[PDB]
Structure formats: structure tokens, C-alpha cells
Design a protein around this nucleic acid. Structure first.
Lengths: 76, 58, 141
RNA sequence: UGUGGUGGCGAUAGCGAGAAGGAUACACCUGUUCCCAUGCCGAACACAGAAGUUAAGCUUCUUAGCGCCGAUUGUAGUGAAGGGUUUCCCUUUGUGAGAGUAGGACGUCGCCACGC
RNA sequence: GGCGGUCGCCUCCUAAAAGGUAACGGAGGCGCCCAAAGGUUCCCUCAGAAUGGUUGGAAAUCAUUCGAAGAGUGUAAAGGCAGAAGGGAGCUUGACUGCGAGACCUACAAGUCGAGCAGGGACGAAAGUCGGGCUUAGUGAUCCGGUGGUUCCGCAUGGAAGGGCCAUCGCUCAACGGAUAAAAGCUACCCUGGGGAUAACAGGCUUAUCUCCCCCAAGAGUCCACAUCGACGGGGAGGUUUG
RNA sequence: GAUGGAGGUAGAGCACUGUUUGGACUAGUUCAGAUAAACUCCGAAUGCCAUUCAUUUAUAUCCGGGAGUCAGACUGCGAGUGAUAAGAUCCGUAGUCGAAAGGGAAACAGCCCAGACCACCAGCUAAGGUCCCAAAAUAUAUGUUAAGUGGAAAAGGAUGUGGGGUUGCACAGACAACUAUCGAGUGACCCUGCGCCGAAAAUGUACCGGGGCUAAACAUAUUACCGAAGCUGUGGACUACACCAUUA
């Protein structure tokens, strides 16, 4: 006799490629709610905030001024 | 330079990375030995296994 | 009995004391302290019993500081009821105390009255205790 | 050099208090004819100007009251490896904070234009 | 076991700083809404407090000064947002058609993001942005039936009847991966197969409760805490009671 | 091992939201002190993702034939339900059992040590031990305990004993005792080692396994020995791979 007892399915959010890893065009980098991380050089934002590569290159997580983070992709 | 490494304890009852470290050095049974070069990687393996092992700088 | 007005949550977890006081380990407002040397839960009724005993002994008043507040609630089920359904109904309030915490303070009264009062307060409590004074800083009157 | 403009760097670049200045430039200031404007108002935005003034913005300089950047060594925690009752506590080995402090700090690097 | 509740989907805590993670564990929401509350171009900055002012009061509406956010964000909560995703004004229908390199999630079936190419457009001087809404709930396989299209087939031939392909409609099939188009009770009058995978006595473990023993001592006892009783509180033993 | 990174737990903090104690004040803001699972200005150890990297090591991936399993249990550690009860229940992480013989723990699935191809009347060790049952020290140096504590249990109580500190009063005479002298010391506090009381259950001593123990107990050091189907020695079987000259 309780009125709790329900939850929703987990969504598998987080980072999907690492710093210093080479990546092909279109590959997901980060799933989020809102911009915890921001898009940088050669990276796009999806409709529900996912971050993706536009170009093949290496992934680098950086610092955006004082309190924000960025992902960039740099081709060789 | 080199180190003689002798196995003095058993691997029953230990976790998996310690078993696999004893294997990566090439140590089979109790009192079997091995000789390796002195590196920063081999010293890390010896430091993970120190409670099971005797080491002599040779 | 002390009770918190307006809790945000009706039930909560209990653990995990793992003694060492985080906060007041020195006398702040009085001259004499009562410091717990074991870690345990301390309830509403134990505090009021100790306070009444401590004040009754000090004719001509003085002052007394209670430095321990019951923030966390209890729950419990009833006899004759099998395990299973959700948490019981809340019955009680407590504060966890860890070793080192000073719990009462007295002033305006010489040693022996203060020492007797702190002796009578400790027999009402489930912890071992010491009696401490303000020792030495840049200024202690 | 001085001033106008436009850029990098985590405010060590900021806030407040105080002083000074009009060479060109920047401003305030003066008007609504004409391009445009007010859910009322030429206040703003838009345009035509050049009487007046360094009072305000702007620039330079002093100031560590508020923010900001902060080590060192000590603790709290905790990888590995062991011991008592196992609620909890302890000993070796490695790692090590948050507070609290000694100190830093009243910016630094670059391009263009004009004047000296 | 029955009675009670629950059965799909979303957000938080549990959850041990990647992801994942139980319980008849602790808290809440959904089964839509908007022709603008969508696209795009310009412009704007909040909530309060203090001071004055006629009706007007604490608090309607005016003026100034402080004010990094203490507001708002269609709807729950978390994560985001003052280079706005918050708030005004003009023009509009991209709430487009054919698609799709590559990733994410995952037993399957499904679910999610996507640069870029082609056709034809909206807004803007341009650069450009636009395949609904700050993000994540607002949904239901297949079979069968209805409506519209079609350069497909059509049992000797020409038609027709009928079928296929494309677009869409008919679900509280809510026991929400959906048994059939269609479904409630009694057995003390009972039968077979299994299970100590599961309930009742006795045992075992545990000791909340119960019986007993204590510590402190306000008090009662005319005076006097302890002859006798012992408030508010605290600590144990036992294994006969209810669990 | 080195280098980079994503992320808010253990701390601990009060800037934000709840909960909260004292003081000054006034409108008629302030100074201090706490607290949290759904608080955060902060923030580890470890785990996780990578790398034309390094050193050792031998696996990993792809296609196909054949399965079995979908009741787990206890013990560290960290959480929920419970009463921070259960050999309880439900998750995470490591091991043993399951499917594991052998030594220790009296007897003992799951604890401590260790993984049995076979033969020996050979040797060295592990955990645990060395007075007799029962193999090996009636070992060595220095101390503590008198309670059979060792060999079950709390709040509280007490001139029991060991060690280290802080001091009041003492031969211009102390504390105690004696009326109305005496001729060395005497009180009061702190932390600490080991003991004492508190301590009552049902067939028969009846938790040292027994005898028995004043060390054959406890603390700190030191060296010998015993001890397993672990390792070594001598010989045999079977398999693989390198050697070797065909002969395997």
C-alpha cells in the first residue's frame, strides 16, 4: 500500500568520443540537456543539444573563457 | 639493469589484475623465477605485486 | 520537546555517523562546556530532561545554551505487521552527535554549581562526556 | 610621443574613493526644411549643423576599503597491504583537499589613422 | 493465498564523481496545447526596495535612485538561457518535396541525431538563417475495413469483377510486444499429479515487545532523597508472553 | 608506465534553497554558532574513454557445427527496506563454495594457507604451532597480572596495583594523635598499562577440546626447530612446441 513506484528509462547521456581520438565526419561527441558544453571549431548542435563533428579530425575538449567548455575538431 | 623476480605466494584468493600481472611477467608456479630489464613499467608491475614477490637488483 | 517547523520531506535515510564532529568543538558563549566522547543519537526527550535538571540546580539563574538541535525524523511500523509495504509513519525527532561535540554551555555561576549541574545533566544522556572550560586564545576575558 | 578606431588574452583586466585635461580627434550642445521616427512626446532613433563648454561621458594619473589570482606545511578523505569488537576503531605504504594563511595585483600583447 | 493497490510513457533521489543497476523503496507529471505560442529581420531588458504624488488604501497607474538575475521561459522536475532560448513590432507558411556520408542506443522489432546534394521558395541591403515550439512525456506491430491517386496486373481475346503499389483514416486492443469477432461464480461432496520451491503446532535465529535487575535523583516521607516509595531520563540479563 | 580528457561521490562549506541557537539593533540590518538524501562558492583517492607512445606477455575479431544455464549460498567492503534486529530481504563490488581433494580453525560447504598425472621408509617451507594426550624451545633479555583474568557482557562504583606530569603545606617544625608532647614528610589534582564488583535457567562439570597451568598468561624484541597431495630430489606415463640427421 504505497503510491510511489515508477521511473523513466535511462537515456545514456555523456561523452561519446574522447580527447585526442580521430573521428570521421558526422560522429556524435556529446549528448546533453541544454548546453553544458558548447560547440567549437567544426562542430554542430542538434535539435536536442547533441554535438557532432562536421569534418574528420582530432577531438579536443577546451575551456571557453572563465566558466565554460568547448569541443573542437581539427583536421590533420 | 636487471631484476630477478621470484614468486613466493599463491594467486588463489587474489583479484584479477594481480593474476594477470603475474602472468604478464611470465611467472607460473610458486618459486619459479624470471629476469627482466629495469624500466619504469616493470617497476610498476613489481609494485602492484610486491606483497607476493621477492626482488633482487641483478 | 523541540520540533522543526515545516519540514520539506516527511521521511529520510538514517546513517552513517562515523564519528568526528564537524562543528562546534569549542566553547563559544559560556564559561563551561559538556563535551561528548562517544557518538550516538540524541532525542527530544533526552535534551529536555537534561535541560530541566541543569536549570533546577542553579537558583539565581545564570544562563544556559543548548547547542544541539533535532533536525532528522524517525519512522517505525507496528507490532503484528509483516515486512513489505512502504516506510512506517514518523514517530520522533533526533540529532546525530559525533565525538568531540560540545552540547551545553553555562555561565554566571562559580565552578561548583556549574560542575554539579553538568554532572546531573550527563546521567540523563546515552553518551560519555567531559567537562571543559574556555582555555586560551587572544582574548578570553 | 599623444589621441581616435578596431582586436587577442580566465576581472592579476573589475568596483568605489581622489586628482587633472581640450592641440587635432571624441563628446555634450543647437535645430527640424528635406530621408526616417514616437503604440503620447525630434526623449530615442534620422537628418541639417558648429553659437557655446570641459560640468557629465572619454583619457591619464594616485589609492589595496570590496571583489578577483593565490603558494608552502599541517590536518579530513581515500589505492594497495594487515589487525581488534566488527555499530565502529587502529597500524604500515602511496596519494591529498576544503578552510585558514605568506604573497600577487589599480592590466598585458598587436594592427590602422592623424597630429608632435 | 485472498482483500487492498499496481500493469505503457516522462523527470528527480536511491546509484558508490563514465555508462548501466533491485525492492508492495522516497517524491511528482502524461494520454495535449498553439495559425501564433511557428520562420525570419529590426529593436528592447527583469523581480523587488526606498523617496515623493488627489481620489487610492500596505498593495492598480506616474518620476528618480540602488538592483547579475532574488524574474520569465504554454504545461512536472532536472539541466540550460541576460552576446538571450526572456519581451515588443513588420513581412510571411520551411509545421517544404526527393533524400542522405557518418554516428548513438540495442537480443529482435523499434527509438535518436545528422553535415551535404537536387527541385522550388520566406525573410533580409547583404552575410545568411529556415525540413515546427529552450531541451527531454502527449502514444499502439500485424490481420481486416474505408476514402483519394496510379504509364501495374487482369485465367481464350476485348472489357469488367477483383487485386497490387503510393498517400491517409478506423484502438482506455490502458493486462498499453496487443489469446478470440465474442466469456462470470460455488464445492464441507469432491478427484489426480507435484512442492518443505509455500502457509499452521514443535525446533532454529532475532529480542521491538514481555518478565526481572539496575544508574541518576526532583520529590513524598511533620524535620530528614535513600525505614519505605522514586517523576523526567539512562544501562543490562532471560528466552516462559505478543511478534 | 607516461600524456591528455569527460564527470560532482568521500570530505568540508554556507554563495543559493530548506531546517535552526544566541546577541545588538529598529520600521514601526548587523555580530557571531550550527545542519542536509532529493542544498553547493568548492572538490580528492580510485575507477572509465583515448594515443602511428613504451616495456613484458598471448591473445582478440569474423564465418560455420553442437550445447548447457535463466531456484544460487556465505564472507570483506558501501547503500536502501527493517528497530543502522535476523543464518532477514533487495541491489553494487571482490573472493571461496557450487564443480575442489590436501594443512589449520576440537568436530565445521562458503573463514586462513594452498590447486591432487603416478611411485619413494628422501629434503625445504606456508597458515598454524613447540609441558602430556600429540610432531617440534619446560628457548633468551626486560617488565606486568593474583583475577584461573587469560578461557562470553553495559551504564555506573571503588584508599587494587605499574608509569609519566602539575602543585598546596613542611627542621623560623609539618598531617594524625592525645591536654586545656612528637622528630619525616603530608594533602589535592591530571593522562595512562593491567586487573575488581555490577554477573540468575532449566538431563551432568558444561565456551580453556581434555589433563593440567602462577606461567604452559599478557607486552616488547631475538633466534632455532616442527609442520601440506605447496616447492625440490630420483624414476616412470601421456600431450604440445622448439631442437635434431632420414630415422621423429
Amino acid at each position: 500500500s504505497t503510491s510511489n513506484g515508477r521511473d523513466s528509462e535511462s537515456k545514456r547521456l555523456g561523452a561519446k568520443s574522447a580527447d585526442g581520438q580521430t573521428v570521421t565526419g558526422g560522429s556524435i561527441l556529446y549528448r546533453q540537456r541544454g548546453t553544458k558544453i558548447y560547440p567549437g571549431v567544426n562542430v554542430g548542435i542538434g535539435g536536442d543539444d547533441t554535438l557532432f563533428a562536421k569534418v574528420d579530425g582530432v577531438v579536443r575538449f577546451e575551456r571557453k573563457g572563465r566558466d565554460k567548455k568547448q569541443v573542437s575538431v581539427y583536421p590533420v | 639493469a636487471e631484476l630477478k623476480i621470484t614468486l613466493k605466494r599463491s594467486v588463489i584468493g587474489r583479484p584479477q589484475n594481480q593474476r594477470a600481472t603475474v602472468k604478464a611477467l611470465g611467472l607460473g608456479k610458486v618459486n619459479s623465477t624470471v629476469t627482466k630489464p629495469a624500466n619504469e613499467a616493470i617497476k610498476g608491475m613489481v609494485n602492484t605485486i610486491s606483497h607476493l614477490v621477492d626482488v633482487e637488483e641483478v | 520537546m523541540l520540533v522543526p517547523k515545516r519540514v520539506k520531506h516527511r521521511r529520510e535515510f538514517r546513517g552513517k555517523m562515523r564519528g568526528e564532529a564537524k562543528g562546534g568543538k569549542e566553547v563559544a558563549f559560556g564559561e563551561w562546556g559538556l563535551q561528548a566522547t562517544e557518538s550516538h543519537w540524541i532525542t527530544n526527550r533526552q535534551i529536555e530532561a537534561a535541560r530541566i535538571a541543569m536549570t533546577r540546580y542553579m537558583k539565581r539563574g545564570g544562563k544556559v545554551w543548548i547547542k544541539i538541535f533535532p533536525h532528522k525524523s524517525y519512522t517505525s511500523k507496528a507490532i503484528g505487521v509483516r515486512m513489505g509495504k512502504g516506510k512506517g509513519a514518523p514517530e520522533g525527532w533526533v540529532s546525530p552527535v559525533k565525538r568531540g561535540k560540545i552540547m551545553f554551555e553555562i555561565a554566571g555561576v562559580p565552578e561548583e554549581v556549574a560542575r554539579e549541574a553538568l554532572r546531573l545533566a550527563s546521567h540523563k544522556l546515552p553518551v560519555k562526556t567531559k567537562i571543559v572550560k574556555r582555555e586560551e586564545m587572544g582574548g578570553e576575558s
